[PDB]
């Protein structure tokens, strides 16, 4: 009756009934329940967080009342469209992980959104997020996206996750000047390019692609992790591109042609003496 945090994780509940008894609830957790629709929540006007991770909700609705909501998670449901969030202006994080969403819409009014999570969906393009100026983390991995584009407005974005998509060219990153972590593994990229402005990158991952040569990253002097396993790199001289990164600690290069060299680990250590981790294993001295 008097709790700021209420947790009904794994309670078999199949319907939202009788939550008006909670006076000043601030966090409501309803994960791994049996909810089939959103309802009977218009009274809990003190909520910052609502958690509906892993249910069977098929449409977003009945949330317009809770305008102090700051964190909303409707992951692992059966959503097909994004809607009914236009009134939650103080939303900072929004998780819609692993649904059946196909298009990015209806988020234009969430100006304070710091993290958008649309991983494991059926999205095919990046659109309609020019308005999210405060976005710091964008997660679109495991989708059907085919081009990097409408990202030019997110100048404060620091983490871009785009693994497991249908990309074929690195482009459209010209304005992400504060970008710090870039994940593009499991795509169809063949050339490293288009990173001229991302000087503050510390974590870059282009593993599991079809890249033949390391280029155009000699200016990335802040690199701390370079993940490039499962590509087609063949020339040890390409590692000259990374010598400006004096704090480079980890590189992944295994299952490249380079690893056929019986001096593979030795050559990495000679080229990049600051590196402490090569693939899974530490450099042992």
């Amino acid at each position: 009756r008097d709790a700021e945090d209420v947790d009904l994780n794994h309670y078999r509940i199949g319907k939202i009934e009788g939550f008006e008894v909670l006076k000043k609830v601030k966090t409501l957790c309803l994960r791994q329940n049996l909810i089939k629709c959103i309802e009977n929540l218009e009274e809990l006007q003190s909520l910052r967080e609502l958690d509906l991770y892993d249910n069977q909700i098929k449409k977003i609705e009945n949330l317009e009342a809770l305008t102090e909501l700051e964190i909303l998670d409707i992951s692992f449901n059966l959503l097909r469209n994004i809607e009914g969030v236009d009134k939650l202006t103080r939303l900072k994080k929004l998780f819609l992980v692993n649904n059946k969403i196909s298009k990015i819409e209806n988020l234009s009014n969430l100006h304070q959104l710091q993290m958008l999570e649309l991983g494991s969906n059926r999205i095919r393009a990046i659109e309609n997020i020019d308005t999210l100026t405060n976005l710091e983390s964008l997660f679109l991995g495991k989708n059907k996206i085919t081009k990097l584009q409408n990202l030019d407005a997110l100048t404060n974005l620091t983490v871009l996750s785009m693994q497991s998509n249908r990309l074929t060219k690195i482009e459209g990153l010209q304005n992400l000047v504060n970008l710090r972590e870039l994940y593009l593994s499991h795509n169809g990229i063949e050339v490293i390019e288009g990173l001229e402005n991302n000087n503050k990158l510390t974590m870059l991952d282009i593993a599991s692609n079809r890249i033949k040569k390391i280029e155009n990253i000699s200016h990335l002097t802040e690199l701390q992790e370079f993940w490039m396993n499962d590509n087609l790199l063949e020339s040890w001289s390409d590692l000259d591109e990374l010598k400006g990164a004096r704090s480079l600690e980890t590189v992944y290069l295994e299952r490249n042609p380079l690893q056929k060299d019986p001096q593979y680990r030795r050559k990495v250590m000679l080229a990049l003496p600051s590196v402490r981790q090569i693939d899974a294993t530490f450099v042992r001295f």
């Binding site: 991770y53 996750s161 899974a280």
Partner: protein
């Protein structure tokens, strides 16, 4: 194992077991190095044992866990917490739900503490990409960082693939492969490796049985194949085996036989997701190669 290793290992297992009996939802927050060390140390042990494990009874064989950490705890209450019993898990330890880290950390810790009495096979959820699985990657970055998931794929890439118990029970996560002619081909699989979308290693983690199929058929999953009862029978005769013990599919009672009890499917996650109402089972083998099935309920 060093005494300093035992000290930190028991500290981790203690804090992981301390939430037992609590009202589910408690997570236990370990430090990043504790989780990372668990990955590195267990990976070294995986590489120091064959990729085709040859185990002897007695041991307890379990199917999927799917990150349901408190249901894993209940399994250990029925079968006995290590080292009171020997365990062989058949894969799929992580999934959706925000308690996959506790599940894998407890399994990895017991693997390090009892490396010749505790065993983990690789499931298709222990892959090195998010081409088809997002929950475990999602949990890692939300509680820690993406690199932690990367370190986990390093450990996953070194898990063993199949096991043969007392020269008579073949164990894998998925099932048989049309490319599988000899046990040597499994031994030829090299680590670290990810799970391909095609080939022997893929089928060992992905294939299913089917009543309808007579030989090899296509899989409604979009990967690998389906095999029928005849496939099973020729396989046991060619390799002089008695049983295929596998997981990977939800079954009503946690266990389910196939091809006149020549194959069995085990599933150890009760009420998977939520729309199902299945039980978890567990097959126990004793010194005389006798199989008994214990069933866990929601």
């Amino acid at each position: 194992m060093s005494d300093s290793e035992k000290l930190n290992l028991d500290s981790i297992i203690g804090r992981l077991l301390e939430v037992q009996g609590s009202r589910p939802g408690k997570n236990v927050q370990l430090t990043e190095n504790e989780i990372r060390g668990l990955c590195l140390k267990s990976r070294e042990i995986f590489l120091s044992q064959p990729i085709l494990l040859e185990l002897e009874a007695p041991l307890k064989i379990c199917g999927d866990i799917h990150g349901q950490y408190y249901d894993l705890l209940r399994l250990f209450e029925y079968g006995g917490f290590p080292p009171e019993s020997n365990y062989l898990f058949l894969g799929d330890y992580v999934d959706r739900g925000k308690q996959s880290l506790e599940t894998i950390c407890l399994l990895l810790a017991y693997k390090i503490k009892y490396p010749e009495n505790f065993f983990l096979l690789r499931g298709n959820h222990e892959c090195a990409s998010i081409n088809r699985i997002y929950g475990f990657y999602d949990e890692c970055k939300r509680r820690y960082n993406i690199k932690l998931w990367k370190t986990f794929t390093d450990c996953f890439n070194c898990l063993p693939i199949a096991a043969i118990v007392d020269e008579k029970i073949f164990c894998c996560h998925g099932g048989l492969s049309p490319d599988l002619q000899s046990m040597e081909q499994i031994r030829r699989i090299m680590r670290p490796t990810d799970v391909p979308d095609q080939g022997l290693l893929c089928d060992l983690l992905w294939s299913d049985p089917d009543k309808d199929v007579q030989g090899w058929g296509e899989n409604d999953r979009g990967v690998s194949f389906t095999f029928g009862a005849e496939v099973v029978a020729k396989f046991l005769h060619k390799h002089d085996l008695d049983l295929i013990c596998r997981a990977h599919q939800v079954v009503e009672d946690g266990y389910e036989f196939f091809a006149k009890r020549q194959l069995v499917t085990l599933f150890s996650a009760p009420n998977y997701c939520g729309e199902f109402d299945n039980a978890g089972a567990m097959m126990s083998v004793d010194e005389t190669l006798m199989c008994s099935f214990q069933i866990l309920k929601p």
